[PDB]
Amino acid sequence: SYDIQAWKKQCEELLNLIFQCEDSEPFRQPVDLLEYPDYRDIIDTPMDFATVRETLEAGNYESPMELCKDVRLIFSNSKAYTPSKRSRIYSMSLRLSAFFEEHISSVLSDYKSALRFHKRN
Ligand SMILES: COCCNC(=O)N1CCN(C(=O)c2cccs2)CC1
Numbered sequence: 001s002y003d004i005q006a007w008k009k010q011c012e013e014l015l016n017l018i019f020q021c022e023d024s025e026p027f028r029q030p031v032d033l034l035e036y037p038d039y040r041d042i043i044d045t046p047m048d049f050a051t052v053r054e055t056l057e058a059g060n061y062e063s064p065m066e067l068c069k070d071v072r073l074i075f076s077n078s079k080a081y082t083p084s085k086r087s088r089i090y091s092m093s094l095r096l097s098a099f100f101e102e103h104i105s106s107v108l109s110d111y112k113s114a115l116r117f118h119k120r121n
Contacts, residue, residue, distance in 0.1 A: 001110055002117040007064040008056065010107045015053050017103065023096040024049060026089045027074050042081055047073040064107050071100055 018024045029050050031039045040046075052070050061067045075097045082090035 002114045004111070004114045004118055006114070007107050007111045008061075010110075011056055011061075011064055011067050012053075014100070014103045014107070015049065015056070018049055018096065018100065021096060021099065023092045023099070026092055027078075027096065036081075039081065043077050045073060045077075047077060049074065064104070064111050068104055068108065071104075075100075 019028065027049050029048055030046055031043075033039060047070055049071075052067060052074075055061055055070065056067060075093050078090050078093035084090070
């Protein structure tokens, strides 16, 4: 299954599955500072799923590993901001992270396999 470009549409599909999840509700767009005045005291590099989709659709990811690093940053930002491990929004992040990781694993494997096949000779 050696298509080097297949990851992109697979990532567009998994973003659609994430935008149909109620658990993505907090992570679709940026944190408003009026609501969270200290957010940028704690979080150096904001990230949200609309920004990930924009970066993909513009052609500014070279690999699904780059997309995966930004999605992971959405979840580490929630872990760094939460004042408790049992907050609503951090709890939503952990379920959404599990869903993401379950679905991205074959996208990554298939892409890495395709590059190795390309380089074989
Ligand atoms: C509806 O969503 C609006 C945009 N998102 C947003 O305001 N936030 C998600 C990122 N945040 C967090 O993960 C945490 C908050 C409380 C604990 S963690 C901080 C608030």
